[PDB]
Every structure is written in C-alpha cells, then in structure tokens.
Structure 1
C-alpha cells in the first residue's frame, strides 16, 4: 500500500499546540519547520512528480487577542491556486522512497512577485497538501495527502512570543 508519513511530527506538534505561524513577505520566506515526508508503496520503476499546495482551513480569518487566537473577521478572496513543484520532479519511485522528501526551498509570500513562491493571505489558516503525479499516464492519476499536524496561520510578523522563541530554540 502507498504510505506517505510526516517526518518530525513531534516537532510539528510543539508548534501546533501553540498554534503555528509562518512569516509571509514581499520576496518570500522559507518555512520552519520544513515539511518532510517518508514514502513507501510507490512503483520503484515508475516516474512521479511531487507537488505541494496550501489549502484554506476555514471560512473566516484569525486574530491574536489577549494571548489567544480567535475568529477575526470574514475571509479575503481565496489566494490564487499556487502549486510548488518539488525540484527532484520528475523522478523514479526508487528516488522518492530511498530518503525523506524535503520541501526546504518553498517560499511563502503575500505579494504576486513570481519566483515559484506560494501566495498566502495574512491571518488565514492553511494546511499543507502533497500530490504525487505519475508521469506518462493517459489517466493522469494523482494521489493527494493532507498533513493536519502542519497547519499554520500566515503572518507578516509573529503574534505569539512563544512561537517567536520556539522558532529560535529549534532553528
């Protein structure tokens, strides 16, 4: 069976229990933690591309009030459908399964300033989602995994000083 497992889930849950935050900027900002997954049950002989996108978790935005994240208004129009193509794409199942698949280079932005960056809206919650696309397939078969442990709010600046401190402590 195809299995995609989250690497460093215990790390992710340390941020998740504070409510996790990722900085978005004009020129784009790498994530911490980095999304990494382990893969078993691909055809080692076949070729596949790895794609990553970020799904809006809620029909509302968030605000940090008295040290607490709370619903903070009605959402902004959905961010334009940005997909990050893993730079190893396309590759053999053997390649993707031999070591963890890391999205270390993905950049999160609040401006449509190109550069393969992902456009997010500040104060909105997103869930990372990975797609495995089989190359040369007339059925264009795609499998999609979501990672609820990796949920975060996009911010132009950190709200929770504990998050600001965790980020320094573990990075």
Structure 2
C-alpha cells in the first residue's frame, strides 16, 4: 500500500504551535523547515515524478494583532496555479523510496518574476501538497497527499517574535 510520511513531524509541530510563517520575497526564499517525505509502496521498477503545490486554507486573510493571529480581511484573488517539479523527476520508485524526498530548493515569492518559484499572497495561510505522477501511464494516474503539520502563513516579514527566534535557533 502507498504510504507517504512527513519527516521531522515533531520539528514542524514546534513551528505549527506558534503558527508557522514563511518569508516571501521578490527573488524567492527557501523554506525552513524543509518539506521532506518518506515513501513506501510504489512500484520500485516504475518511473514517477514528484510535484509540490500550496493550497489556500481559508476564504480570508490573517493579521497578527496583540500577539494573536486573527482573521484580517477578505482574501486576495487566488495566486496563479504554481507547481514545483522535484528536480530528481522522473525517477524509479526505488530512487524515491531509498531516502527521504527533500523539497530543499523550492523558493516562495510574492512577485511572478519566474525561476520555477511558488507565488503566494502575503498574510494568507497555505498547506503544502505533494503529487506522485506515474510516467508512461495512459490513465495519467495521480496521487495527492496533504501535510496539515506543515501549514503556514506567507509573510513579507516575521510577525511572531517566537517564530523569528525559532527560525534562527533550529536553523
């Protein structure tokens, strides 16, 4: 049976209990923590691609007021459909299953200035989503997995001083 497990779930949850934040910039910014998954129950002989996107969690934006994240207004129109292709793609099931699959190079941005970046709206909450695509499949079968532990608010600057400190500390 196909099983996709979050790596470092305890680390993610240290950030989630503060409400996690990720910086977006013009030129794009890497995530900490990095999203990493362990995979079992692929066909080791088959070839797959791994894709990453970010799903908008709410019909509203957030604001950090008096040390509390609270609903902050109506949402911006949805960021365009951005998908990140894992740079190991396409590859054997055996390749994906032998070691955690790491999205260490994905950059989050708030300007559509290209470079395979993920466009997010500042002060909106997003949940990472991984897709497994089988190569050469006439049915174009896809699997999609969400990672609730990894939810975060996109920000141009850290709001929560505990997040700023955690980010310097564990990284």
TM-score interval w.r.t. the shorter chain? Answer: over 0.9
TM-superposed CA distance for 1:91, in Å, is 0.1
TM-superposed CA distance for 1:55, in Å, is 0.1
TM-superposed CA distance for 1:36, in Å, is 0.2
Match of residue 74 from structure 1: 74
Match of residue 96 from structure 2: 96
SS in 2 for 1:53: strand
TM-superposed CA distance for 1:135, in Å, is 0.2
Q: What residue ranges of structure 2 are gaps of 5+ in the alignment?
A: none
Mapped partners of 2:130, 2:76: distance in 1: 24
Q: So what's the TM-score if we normalise by structure 2?
A: 1.00
TM-superposed CA distance for 1:83, in Å, is 0.1
Mapped partners of 1:89, 1:164: distance in 2: 33
SS in 2 for 1:22: strand
TM-superposed CA distance for 1:138, in Å, is 0.3
Q: What residue ranges of structure 1 are gaps of 5+ in the alignment?
A: none
TM-superposed CA distance for 1:62, in Å, is 0.1
For the aligned residue pairs, the C-alpha RMSD in angstroms reads 0.2
Mapped partners of 1:51, 1:80: distance in 2: 16
SS in 1 for 2:73: coil
TM-superposed CA distance for 1:168, in Å, is 0.6
Mapped partners of 1:106, 1:72: distance in 2: 27
Mapped partners of 1:61, 1:69: distance in 2: 10
Moved over 3 A (4+): none
TM-superposed CA distance for 1:26, in Å, is 0.1
SS in 2 for 1:79: coil
TM-superposed CA distance for 1:69, in Å, is 0.1
Q: Does 1:23 align with 2:23?
A: yes
Mapped partners of 1:108, 1:114: distance in 2: 11
TM-superposed CA distance for 1:94, in Å, is 0.1
TM-superposed CA distance for 1:144, in Å, is 0.2
SS in 1 for 2:89: coil
Give the count of matched residue pairs.
171
Q: So what's the TM-score if we normalise by structure 1?
A: 1.00
Mapped partners of 2:129, 2:149: distance in 1: 11
Mapped partners of 1:113, 1:95: distance in 2: 32
Mapped partners of 1:125, 1:52: distance in 2: 16
SS in 2 for 1:72: strand
Mapped partners of 1:156, 1:148: distance in 2: 22
TM-superposed CA distance for 1:59, in Å, is 0.3
SS in 2 for 1:163: helix
TM-superposed CA distance for 1:67, in Å, is 0.3
